[PDB]
Amino acid sequence: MAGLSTAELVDIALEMAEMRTLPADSAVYVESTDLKRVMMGIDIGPAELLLARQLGCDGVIAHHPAGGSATLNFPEVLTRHVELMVEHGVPATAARDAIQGLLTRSLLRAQSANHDHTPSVARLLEMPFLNIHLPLDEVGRRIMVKTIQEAVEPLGDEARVQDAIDALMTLPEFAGAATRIMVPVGAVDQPLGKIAVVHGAGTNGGYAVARAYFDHGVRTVLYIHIAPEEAERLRREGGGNLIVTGHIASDLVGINRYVQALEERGVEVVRMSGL
């Protein structure tokens, strides 16, 4: 089996996410036409690129934006929070107002980054390099939604926060994780009501997105991570439940589907940085 191109490594991820084009938080920094053995990690910086070269890897795949147009255009993906809220019955105006804080600060952080820092190291090393973020989190989102829905839907109004956690614990990524699923707002024994799986929108929606879901009929919100001071502000105010599943464990759901699709295409994947 011939090695894959970076264009093919992107296509495999878009096919499974059902996306027609690479989203703004993902980029090819260094192209290649023949990758047989790649190193894949969630967080890749210059030290990990030097590591891949010492291991003799053909190229590197990262999950998190590593710079370039992925770090620069990252705030373009945030509008996906609006789609998820509207999907769950939050009014479009309420949903758009809720992300305005996160968007304003994400644009300022994007302008401030040293975008060419990790790509310049990849170019100097001649190391094929790309990050795939939103397509893999979208895959993860879909699995997590289907897993919870199939378990909580026959329960109806009897479903509790514990039942969505039990459903997520049927996934090997959560079952085998070193981390635990937490409930920083609300409790395990509280009614579930409607659940919103908020993942695959770039970053968690923090306080303001969870508040807008709680105020518009969605009692339980699920994030993969939350800022501690944002968890505390929501917890003291109450009005709903927050499930926080765990950054790495949650990312590995869509990432493991991808690694499997690469291996079937005959690419060897060297797992590291959380894989």
Binding residue for a second copy, selected from 117, 194, 233, 257, defined by CB under 8 A: 117
Q: How many angstroms separate the first and last alpha carbons of the chain?
A: 24
Q: How far apart are CA 51 and CA 34, in angstroms?
A: 20
Stretch that binds a second copy, among 22-30, 86-94, 146-154, 246-254 (CB under 8 A): 246-254
Site string for a second copy, 14-53 (x = CB under 8 A): ---------------------------xxx-xxxx-xx-x
Q: Which of 34, 35, 53, 36 is nearest to 44 (CA)?
A: 53
Binding residue for a second copy, selected from 30, 62, 226, 242, defined by CB under 8 A: 226
Q: Tokens in use for 38?
A: 């790649």
Q: Which residue's CB is nearer to a second copy, number 68 or number 135?
A: 68
Residue 203 touching Cl ion (CB under 5 A): yes
Q: How far is CA 274 from the centre of its chain?
A: 13
Q: How far apart are CA 139 and CA 2, in angstroms?
A: 26
Residue 124 touching a second copy (CB under 8 A): yes
CB 205 → Cl ion: shortest distance, Å?
A: 9
Binding residue for a second copy, selected from 94, 125, 145, 151, defined by CB under 8 A: 125
Q: Which residue's CB is nearer to a second copy, number 123 or number 265?
A: 123
Stretch that binds a second copy, among 29-37, 212-220, 222-230, 261-269 (CB under 8 A): 222-230
Q: Which of 141, 140, 163 is nearest to 151 (CA)?
A: 163
Place of tokens 């992300």: 99
Q: Which residue's CB is nearer to Cl ion, number 220 or number 245?
A: 245
Q: Which does 203 bind (CB under 5 to 8 A by kind): a second copy, Cl ion, none?
A: Cl ion
Place of tokens 């192209």: 31
Q: How far apart are CA 270 and CA 157, in angstroms?
A: 45
Residue 246 touching a second copy (CB under 8 A): yes
The H helix count followed by the E strand count for the chain is 12, 9
Binding residue for Cl ion, selected from 225, 257, 272, 273, defined by CB under 5 A: 225
State the chain's maximal CA–CA distance in angstroms: 58
Q: Tokens in use for 83?
A: 């789609």
Distances (CA, A) of 204 to 48, 136, 175, 189, 224: 26, 15, 22, 24, 7
Q: Which residue's CB is nearer to a second copy, number 159 or number 253?
A: 253
Stretch that binds a second copy, among 12-20, 134-142, 163-171, 242-250 (CB under 8 A): 242-250
Q: How many CB atoms lie within 10 A of CB 8?
A: 15
Residues that bind a second copy (CB under 8 A): 41-43, 45-48, 50-51, 53-55, 68-69, 72, 101, 104-105, 107-117, 120-121, 123-125, 178-180, 182, 184, 225-226, 228-229, 231-232, 244, 246-248, 270-275
Residues that bind Cl ion (CB under 5 A): 203-204, 225
